[PDB]
From a paper:
Citrullination, the loss of a positive charge on the arginine side chain to form citrulline, is catalyzed by peptidylarginine deiminase 4 (PAD4) of the PAD enzyme family. PAD4 is implicated in rheumatoid arthritis (RA), where citrullinated epitopes serve as important diagnostic and pathological factors. The active form of PAD4 is a homodimer, and dimerization greatly affects enzyme activity because monomeric mutants are less active. In this study, we identified GAGs as physiological allosteric coactivators of PAD4.
PAD4 activation was observed at 0.1 mM CaCl2 in our assays; therefore, we aimed to determine the PAD4–GAG complex structure under these conditions using Dp20. The obtained map showed two dimers of PAD4 connected by two Dp20 chains bound proximal to the region spanning a flexible, unresolved loop, including R123 to R137, and rich in positively charged residues (123-RTGKVKPTRAVKDQR-137). The two dimers were stacked face-to-back and angled close to 90° in the x–y plane, forming a cross-like double-propeller structure. This organization allows interaction between the NLS region of the lower dimer (K59, K60, and K61) and the region near the Ca3-5 calcium-binding sites of the top dimer. In this case, different structures were formed, consisting of a single PAD4 dimer with GAG oligomers spanning across the dimer to bridge two regions proximal to the N-terminal of the protein (“handbag” like structure). Importantly, these interaction anchors between the GAG and PAD4 were located near the contact surface between the monomers, encompassing the positively charged NLS. Additionally, as inferred from the density map, a GAG chain in the correct conformation can make contact with a loop containing R123. The observed change in the dimer–dimer organization between Dp12 and Dp20 at 0.1 mM Ca2+ consists of the introduction of an additional GAG anchor point for a longer Dp20 oligomer, which introduces torsion sufficient to pull the dimers together and form the 90° double-propeller, cross-like structure. This, in turn, allows for the interaction between the NLS, located in the N-terminal domain of the lower dimer, and the calcium sites Ca3-5 located on the side of the top dimer.
Numbering used by the authors:
A (entry chain B): 5 to 54, 65 to 125, 136 to 157, 172 to 216, 224 to 339, 351 to 370, 400 to 515, 522 to 632, ...
B (entry chain A): 5 to 54, 65 to 125, 136 to 157, 172 to 216, 224 to 339, 351 to 370, 388 to 392, 396 to 515, ...
The structure:
Amino acid sequence: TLIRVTPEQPTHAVCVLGTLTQLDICSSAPEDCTSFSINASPGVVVDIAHSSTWPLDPGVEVTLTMKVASGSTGDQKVQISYYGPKTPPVKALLYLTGVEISLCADITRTGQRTWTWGPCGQGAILLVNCDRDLDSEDLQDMSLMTLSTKTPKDFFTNHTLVLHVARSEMDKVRVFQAKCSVVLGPKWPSHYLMVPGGKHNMDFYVEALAFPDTDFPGLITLTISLLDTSNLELPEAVVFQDSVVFRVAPWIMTPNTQPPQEVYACSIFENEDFLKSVTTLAMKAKCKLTICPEEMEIGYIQAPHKTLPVVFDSGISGLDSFGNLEVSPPVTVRGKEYPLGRILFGDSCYPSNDSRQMHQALQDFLSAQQVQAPVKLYSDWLSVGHVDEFLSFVPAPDRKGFRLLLASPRSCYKLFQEQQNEGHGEALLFKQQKIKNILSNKTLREHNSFVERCIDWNRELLKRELGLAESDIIDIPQLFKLKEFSKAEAFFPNMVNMLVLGKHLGIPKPFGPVINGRCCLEEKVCSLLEPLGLQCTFINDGTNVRRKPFSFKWWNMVP
Amino acid sequence: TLIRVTPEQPTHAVCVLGTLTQLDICSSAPEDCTSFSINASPGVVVDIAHSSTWPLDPGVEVTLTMKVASGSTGDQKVQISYYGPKTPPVKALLYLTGVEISLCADITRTGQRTWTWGPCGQGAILLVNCDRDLDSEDLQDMSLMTLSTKTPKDFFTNHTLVLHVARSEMDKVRVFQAKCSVVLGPKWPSHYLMVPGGKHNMDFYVEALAFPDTDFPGLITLTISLLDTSNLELPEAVVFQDSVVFRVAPWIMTPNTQPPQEVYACSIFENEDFLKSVTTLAMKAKCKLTICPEEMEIGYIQAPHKTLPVVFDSDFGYVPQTGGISGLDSFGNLEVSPPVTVRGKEYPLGRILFGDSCYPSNDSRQMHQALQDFLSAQQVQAPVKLYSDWLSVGHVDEFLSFVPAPDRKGFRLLLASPRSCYKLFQEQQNEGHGEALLFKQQKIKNILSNKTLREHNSFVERCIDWNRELLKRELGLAESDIIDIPQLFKLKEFSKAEAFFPNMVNMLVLGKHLGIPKPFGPVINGRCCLEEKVCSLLEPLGLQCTFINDGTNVRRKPFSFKWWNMVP
């Protein structure tokens, strides 16, 4: 700020430690003036920012700061002298006064005011309080704001400290003083602080109320202001202001390759056959299987002090379900490394009167969480319309680190022809049809060509939207047959959707052809999956799999 | 698209140029094959990624493309000679075919296929059809995209081409297929283009319907899809897809420092003397004064086709809340700074400044948020909030304004500073002639013997100092570029500030010629003292001032700096 002084009478000024208070000596100068000498207190930082006896430049900023907060009203005073050849120097007095006002927060991102990203960047992280709540848990889920002012005892008789936020971001932040006392929030964008003289520390804890959205660009700001108030008839004037940086935590979705922590079940009560295999699997996996004690997708928000998990659930189309919403492993797309995955979702290739796609609200919601940029897919030609019915990710403890199982009906034809060319071509599937009875259906060949053509489009679109390669995709046999409105469906029960319970998993049984008392599809999928290092269990086939939240924190990427 | 070859029979396909033709080699491989070979001419651009014994690698990439276009089916032949150790070499066949597909437009931000800002960006700007506006006339002002298809004639009997926009973007693009023409717009998301085979060129004219706003970042995309319908019962299969991207041109405001092209007037009063002075002043400025025969800001949406002037209001181009609004969000509040440099970020197109309070409060006033989010969507001009609620008018131009100056950085900011008025009054009374009458008439010694005025007046100087530091940090200004205009302020009910005598800074500027309202000040030596100072400080630089007893909107030239060359 600027203060201007009149030589005929003393006046009162205030400088805050840390800011360079500008002083102009020329505009309000005495009538005749050409040379200046500074004889000031040793404790005052009086610098010059733009002894060579430089003349009175129009704009010559003299920066002023003082360190030691006083005890009385304006102990320190400053005087200037101006020596010329016309008369002895004239005098000006300034009643200066030091104070210290500091607002420190989670500056190190370890646990400061306007939202900001950055792996090496300044800004605290806010956990979204989508629930309405003490003690340690409050100390550990809200960010830390600490207020420290060193002042003269009677200094705040004529001064005031005010704490405020911008009016566009007022709705989605809230701060408590330390039941909890509301300082700011959706209703109060500003407040005045009651700080007595000397030292008084009042601490604040910060929370949000919403996730990044379309109408929420990505700032929440804080600014501290100092008011000069010496006269009771004039409006309040400002002397000091600081404005700095903190950011909100988004929502996240969890893939099927993380080491699980807790898995669940449903209520169909076929568990005695269903949950027997999965229960023995969890005993093999040493995972804690609390079945459902008695559609729902599991994510987590994180801060430097907490990683509280959350769950979400849901003019309705068949492509809007979360089964059409599948998250890739930690990925790297064209240099942009998404350690939190790229959400993958299916819609049509061109819209028409009959095309289907997601609600734009949901796509924008996943877009606004710029940690996971979504990807458009093509799963409209399929009758149900989900991506999980033809794509899946399974853990890979070697090579690249994750395996994409993709349905491919053309390897099924290869195997069926191969085992028919071995003499025993009368294997019974499931009515029951021979291998010849299926290889002698020309309609199936054309249906298969059409379905594989639709598959390849999605395939290419994953290889470009996930940074994939030919070595990272493995094909599983699955024949397809069309239906009403010429929509595709699987021939035998789907084998690409399955329960990943670790490095060993559960796949539904094919109930297919029997080869010397064994199912050929089963031995093939085991010869294609197990050598990588997995173990597969086969069962007649509702399950939600909570996993360990990522070691990577969302604030360490550059979106 | 992926192409798969089965050893039982060869497969025919159409390979559109622009996609590296990928070949699948593992899913449908022969039962005894472990290696295979290729046969083609040296001129063929064959792309292989690991004769020569190429085995069945899990990640061997095979992409093929051609150096010509085919209007005749299978003008080139490519046999893939799989070779087996104990099996005679089986040969997968593929009669190559390429159609010439061209989606040509103004795609260097000059209206991956993406949009990037900067002087060397990619994209196409479209201008808003804010008018209520045959085929020969609109070809110059509109954006025309050229779709060139060179395909065999028999294609479009079992193939269809489809143009479309997303199911969120229809109401923001209208395309005309070169009166009434609905291709894809407010009601139609897609169009089945009836394209005769052979070689054919197609033109579309594109106009918007909305400016960048809160919900619209500004980018739109248009995609053409090439399908396949060989069978009449099964669904269509996509063969190729191409895309282009546009951005809506955003409205740009106009500062008070740009050369004039058309000055406008309003016959609110008779003001014959004012009118004669204005026409004399405009003839001195050599501008075409268009009197209206019986606020509104005249900007421009600059595009690489035309720079249509834009009328923004609360002819040219004309671009709401039910009620209960406050008067201080009017358009006199929004003033455009010249190009500046703020904390490193440099703004060639200006920094919009407006009226608000320094800290939000219950009695504080601020602009309607709609304009703030609007001009924020205009990422070209990042706004700045200032401390100008301490007046009862709340307009930033009531105490500061930018005048042209051929010296240094080309602009000078007049700030209404109380304290120079008192300084000059002190000097004039010190020299002796301190009893001249002002204007209700009051004396020079009387005001200098008024201390209440010195306190209201010093408080206003404190507010001016705060806003001065704000401009030094939010406009990157300096202390030497601020002329302290002598001007006194007073307070009224609710402690709001007002001008005492007519404000010399709320002046209608029409170039270098300052139409300053008359101060009606003390008379000494023949002239007015405030007039004396303003003539003794501006004239040594070269300005010319005329003092009228004061509704003049001035359309001005564009900055000639293309908006698509800067990074928000």
